[PDB]
Amino acid sequence: MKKILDSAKNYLNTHDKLKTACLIALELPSSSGSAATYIYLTDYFRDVTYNGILYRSGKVKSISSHKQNRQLSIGSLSFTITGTAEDEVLKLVQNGVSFLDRGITIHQAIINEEGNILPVDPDTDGPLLFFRGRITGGGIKDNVNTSGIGTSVITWNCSNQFYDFDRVNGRYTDDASHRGLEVVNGTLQPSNGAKRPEYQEDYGFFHSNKSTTILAKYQVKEERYKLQSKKKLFGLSRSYSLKKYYETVTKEVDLDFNLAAKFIPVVYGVQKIPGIPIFADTELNNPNIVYVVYAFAEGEIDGFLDFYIGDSPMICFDETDSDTRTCFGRKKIVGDTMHRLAAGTSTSQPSVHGQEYKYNDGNGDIRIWTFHGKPDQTAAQVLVDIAKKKGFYLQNQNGNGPEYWDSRYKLLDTAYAIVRFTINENRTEIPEISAEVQGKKVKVYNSDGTIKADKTSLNGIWQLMDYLTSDRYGADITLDQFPLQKVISEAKILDIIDESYQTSWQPYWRYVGWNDPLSENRQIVQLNTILDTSESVFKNVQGILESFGGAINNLSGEYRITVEKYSTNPLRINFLDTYGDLDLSDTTGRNKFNSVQASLVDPALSWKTNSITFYNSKFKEQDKGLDKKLQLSFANITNYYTARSYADRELKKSRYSRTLSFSVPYKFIGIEPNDPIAFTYERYGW
Amino acid sequence: TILDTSESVFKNVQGILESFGGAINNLSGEYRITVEKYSTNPLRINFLDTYGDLDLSDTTGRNKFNSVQASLVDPALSWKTNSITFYNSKFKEQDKGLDKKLQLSFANITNYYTARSYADRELKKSRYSRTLSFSVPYKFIGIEPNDPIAFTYERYGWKDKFFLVDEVENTRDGKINLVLQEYGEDVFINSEQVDNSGNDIPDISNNVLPPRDFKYTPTPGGVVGAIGKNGELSWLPSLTNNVVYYSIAHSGHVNPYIVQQLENNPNERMIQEIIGEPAGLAIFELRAVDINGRRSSPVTLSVDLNSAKNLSVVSN
Amino acid sequence: TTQYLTLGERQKNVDVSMQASSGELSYLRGDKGIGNANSFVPR
Amino acid sequence: TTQYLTLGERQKNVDVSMQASSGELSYLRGDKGIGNANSFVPR
């Protein structure tokens, strides 16, 4: 619920004649966008001056009704304009298409007995915001009938605040997009499209989207001259052919590097993601050494846990797996990360920013540099040093000097990893690399006021809040459009300790988001989310909300994130306050559910879906054995027990359900969806 | 074209027509085949000639398209299919990056360049669209679909505006129902598609501005003033007009205080009061916003708050 | 003698906003060259 | 040396009406033990 000023409630209760006025602020298309001109309108009989803005009366005949529910969807509102006005008819007819995606802000204003606006909204001591969105259509109906009165109505179609969620806002590996270069028209030209002012100088994504498929010829310092380690059986006989030592010899290498431009993901937990190779190359003289830089996740990242070299991770899952192939430590119970290689027999801990790990294994050796994302991080020192010496083949082939990998290639806000392979007769090619990365660092807002963003969090509420407050890869919603206290309380609600299982039952604790093997981490919901930014932010938000069954609503300009939960202070409504219309309907027969199919990736085995079905035997017996499955999203959950508790909770909750619909006067203004109502009606026994 | 005769001749004809966006109609016993082409001699219809009722509707929001998938077969690759995707980057940017693909039949097309030109032309044409419908007397008998119409209506800015018929219905009373279709400019195959007016790129909408002067004045002691006077925060209204409020937050306080733009007086400092706080270097963030909600650059500063002077009398 | 190193796959997305070029044909058919779909040098 | 006899496939159906147990994790990840999904002894 949106609390309104006490004086507002007193006026609404006392006064039976409310002179409501709707204030419309509409954005006209025009050049010089910074000079954005607005046309203000109102359906009140006189012009209303509100905060120095004069809302002209007339031209507004009617306004539709704003509607919202617990499922995220793009609400729509349509308001009409008098078609007899010349300005409006011309605007709609000859510019009604240029008006698309232009802002409109409708305010609901109660007018005092003295013509002033009653300060309903406590946040501004002003009106209570009624609608906000962007136009999405037009339409005019000039109906002329002979011998009568004609009609000319202009209809404007709008979408509510959630139409801003149709955007896809994800960093794209292409150099032109990342650096903000203008859409190329012939030659290139810099512009101001960069997400951050410091991106323009970041050439990190250079060499990103290109396909160098050539028959390169290399000079290998070997097998042409100098002493050769071959001694004949005879004491005096010797091998006069000189080779197996440094001297040039021609060699044709048919390299084929296809670095595409894929959307970078975002990870909010311990999840396994692939690499997006942004730079590929091989040493100038030895083709067997290849440098490939992969892009993982975004922003400051807690670090890498492990690297998957062609489906074979560097750490063996159990005791059993270690015999099949070489490994280093276990993951089942010890649950150590990759950082054991640098610090043998240490504790479990994520990787280190700018630290090299030499993964020595059969078939060759691998050198990995873990560069965690950072708002301001320097260029890859190793690559810069190599470039200064012109060690890269494609650098000399294209003629680039020490700028091929310059100090200015500081990949910002990207947790990339440099992997140096040593191609041999055993590792004959470069295998696709995947890694287990901890999520992005996420802000947690304590109730007192202090925050902490030093680690990633599994809480769904805070993950959604972080995704909804980042302009560079999420929805550009400022923190000042969120009720902090309510969000914090909901986050606490999603952190209730669950007692259906012990912490010792899940062995793969480190790889389900648990940072400690002892401390209490039985949260009721734990989401290890991969936010593929390729999809619309609308779909990402819906996917996050479907994990814990929450709901996001924006009525009165505040973004409410709420979850079906009990309340000890519900709003009391008596039937006599209703308009007297009532309708109780039963939906239990339709919504009875007794099973659910859970396809969840289990870290215990190489990350792969387990088709697990949760069913409630008692419900099936009541259902006469008939199967009834509710589609439940397990994509963001890797902990088996949290998934099971979620499934059982939903199955239980789907057993009793009725829909009660009535109406209520304007006294009860500000009833958000998912609000606790205490409806008392003595005739029914309620 | 490969015409698999197993399929119905209806399907084959439709498949051929879909390739170049043509249309076949049989009204008055003539098998007329036509395509969306510009005409220099349209039929002139005025509103008065039309029946009274008129109806103009907009469908641009629904029919905006910015990408297309082309599973064209390539003779170079032993006549195997290539999954080629054509997208207009500018349209996607105007679409907030959203992907809007239109199902386009690329069969019976093997020249890649013709396929690309067809895709780009369709994407361009699918950017402007309206559906204007009215009723015309029997005098205008024989208006085939996809016919050029020059509709003139003084009340609007339309003088021989170019439309294209989309649905003609003939009744036995003679009343003819029409549903026209408005298009962009020079978007037809017949038209001269060269457009030279796009050089002037639109600019960004940064309509919000920061405050010109925002400084903190510590309150001196020795004067009653107000009880527990930590101090006050004042600044001139931010250069951008159309402001409902500015917000200010103390470093250790969860919520930001808000100031109302009650007075639209240029060069009038508006005072925000801070009371009951420690005397120290507290981060100050002059949050600013407009009616639309867009925010200017907040003012980040840390000023040593002056300890309250002239405190309250001893309570008891 | 002959050794080949591979990585990734060619990207078949084409931006028709830019003027047509033979580099697109070279890239889309797997010709040996250096460049993207929107700018390809076929050698 | 070693000989293996195989038959059937593990059943992933879980009855959430009964309280949770570690046997479910053991059974659902292919561990060696005696029992069903709702009651598994992992050796």
Tab-separated table of C-alpha atoms in Angstrom, chain A residues 23 26 39 69 112 128 137 228 256 322 390 396 411-412 482 500 512 528 548 575 621 644 650 659:
chain	number	residue	atom	x	y	z
A	23	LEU	CA	-3.011	16.878	-15.004
A	26	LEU	CA	2.870	15.305	-22.756
A	39	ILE	CA	2.307	20.369	-23.799
A	69	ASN	CA	-2.131	-7.266	-11.321
A	112	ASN	CA	-9.255	22.340	-2.292
A	128	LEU	CA	-0.710	11.265	-6.495
A	137	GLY	CA	-0.578	4.799	-31.222
A	228	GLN	CA	71.665	-32.207	-33.187
A	256	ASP	CA	41.028	-19.809	-38.717
A	322	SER	CA	40.458	-38.580	-9.911
A	390	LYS	CA	56.024	-7.427	-31.608
A	396	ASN	CA	53.542	-8.137	-37.740
A	411	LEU	CA	38.896	-3.765	-20.543
A	412	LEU	CA	36.587	-1.985	-18.099
A	482	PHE	CA	12.297	2.528	-4.692
A	500	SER	CA	13.707	-28.883	6.177
A	512	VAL	CA	25.990	-23.769	-4.863
A	528	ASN	CA	22.183	-18.576	-8.843
A	548	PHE	CA	10.601	-16.810	-5.795
A	575	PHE	CA	-18.754	-4.813	3.115
A	621	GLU	CA	-4.711	-39.555	-4.087
A	644	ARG	CA	12.303	-29.068	-3.444
A	650	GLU	CA	3.778	-24.053	-4.395
A	659	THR	CA	-11.429	-14.996	-6.430
